[PDB]
Symmetry: C3
């Protein structure tokens, strides 16, 4: 039944899903070591650290394609939508916002929908690299990977923003799980746009998104 | 008597004022910890360290807008104007140059005129951001801020040039005075170009520069 | 006999010489401290470190001119040609590749031909900076210097890729040999294109290349 895959391809991410990626990335940024002190003792750095988690995919892919990184800061609807989630994650009265979404079922849903945002971001970079370089395979893999796990690759300079400098934990020395899956996804979808992979885009899009959501939900259930 | 603010608006910064900004920046760069040994034992580094103090506003705004940073190096008149001040601040015979402009009254005039350069640089970035993005308020604030206190934001990587690495002192962790005032100026003039702020550009221009000159003069008088 | 310089100017670098530059840079990158452990324990990082050694000139000249750094990743022939030399230098069975090219005569030819590729890279950026800026003297020197010793200038951030962070060893604090010669080459050829230097481009090209090959050969002979 390929009938359901094409219904899945008609999803729009502007309202609900973008907020899920913003919330999961910000909550994960808070749970990092010493992040709570940074917001309290320096809201500016914790906000800019959050923006690097939410828009690290767009910021990195813009630096690689020589596009203006401030261009990501133009969509005031998306920056405000993320900044509001940032304020409620750390500054909500009685910590009701974080304590609510830290609940296991809600954290699973939000984390699962961020993985859905990861797919279109990979395809967005692959098709966008196609508009700058046509059949350039390596360029499509790079920009697609950059939008999939941008925050994972700038993580060395994002840590510098909060004030932590760990020159030993590069993303190329030890590839973390989200960065290594994006690279696999960027490679698979690049083989799709080049027609070297025998499957429709809509079907490969669904099976990769399911294989991704199934893993993180498994990790989150086996962790608690 | 608004007949005085507009006579101030017609000022030109190319001869006198650019040099004052270049001089105050270089002199402030020399007074930093260890800058004297660097020039003597590494003139290339101390020169490149100074260029980030003089044109750091232009460099950062060029990186944020995906403009060529080497474009700042095209104006051979402005680069040579700042380089000669750099050579005379550190290498003049008998140190007559530094000891002359370190005298409290002259250092007040030079520092006060650099603050005037800060205003047009903020407005330069604000109007230049308007050319690339029409009514994007955040882009205008960022670029106008980047030109106002460029060297203050790249201060982390400017320290790396001379050899010092302090990951704990980010401009977003503890905002210094010149950087936080530029941000205040960038926000005000952005509300001006968007007509949310009920005052003419030239009156706001004059009252902001005066509020900026008066503070630094007061700081330098209460410091000595 | 200027008829020999004209024949030297007809050299094409796409087949043989590009590999030599890729070989000498990768081999020099392997002989660095702790580089063998990185490839074995992290092939992704040692590969990206090798790419910074081979295409560091094109990358830095691209960042300085606001050109897309991923644009260097479009020439799939050049990237694969360098990546193949990278895989053999580190993973060849019984280390036969490295042990072969480490032989002093072969290491002298490869390193000598890299010095030739250094020349065209200088004039490439000089003529490329001319395409963007007419008679801007400083821009031509910079981009010509960037392509000549790009890997040497990004050395600080290249060391960070492999995981070593030495903030005390900047290229502007103590200029190494290949970086200080490129700068001399960039200035000389910039005076050539500007016709301030009284010598034909072909002759200055040859005498500079010969002056370059003779030195590194002498260094490699007096070092063993």
């Amino acid at each position: 039944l390929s009938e359901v895959s094409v219904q899945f391809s008609q999803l729009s991410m502007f309202p609900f899903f973008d907020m899920a990626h913003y919330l999961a990335s910000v909550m994960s940024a808070r749970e990092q070591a010493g992040a709570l002190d940074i917001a309290s003792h320096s809201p500016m750095a914790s906000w800019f650290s959050a923006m690097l988690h939410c828009f690290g995919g767009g910021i990195l892919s813009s630096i690689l394609l020589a596009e203006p990184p401030v261009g990501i800061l133009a969509n005031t609807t998306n920056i405000m939508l993320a900044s509001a989630i940032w304020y409620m994650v750390y500054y909500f009265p009685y910590d009701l916002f974080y304590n609510c979404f830290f609940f296991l079922p809600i954290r699973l849903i939000a984390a699962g929908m961020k993985e859905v945002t990861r797919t279109w971001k990979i395809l967005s970079g692959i098709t966008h690299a196609h508009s700058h370089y046509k059949d350039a395979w390596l360029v499509m893999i790079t920009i697609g990977w950059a939008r999939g796990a941008g925050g994972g690759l700038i993580s060395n300079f994002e840590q510098l923003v909060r004030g932590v400098w760990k020159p030993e934990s590069n993303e190329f020395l030890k590839m973390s799980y989200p960065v290594k899956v994006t690279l696999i996804g960027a490679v698979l979808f690049t083989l799709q746009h080049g027609h070297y992979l025998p499957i429709s885009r809509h079907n490969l899009m669904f099976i990769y998104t399911m294989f991704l959501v199934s893993i993180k939900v498994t990790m989150m259930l086996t962790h608690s």
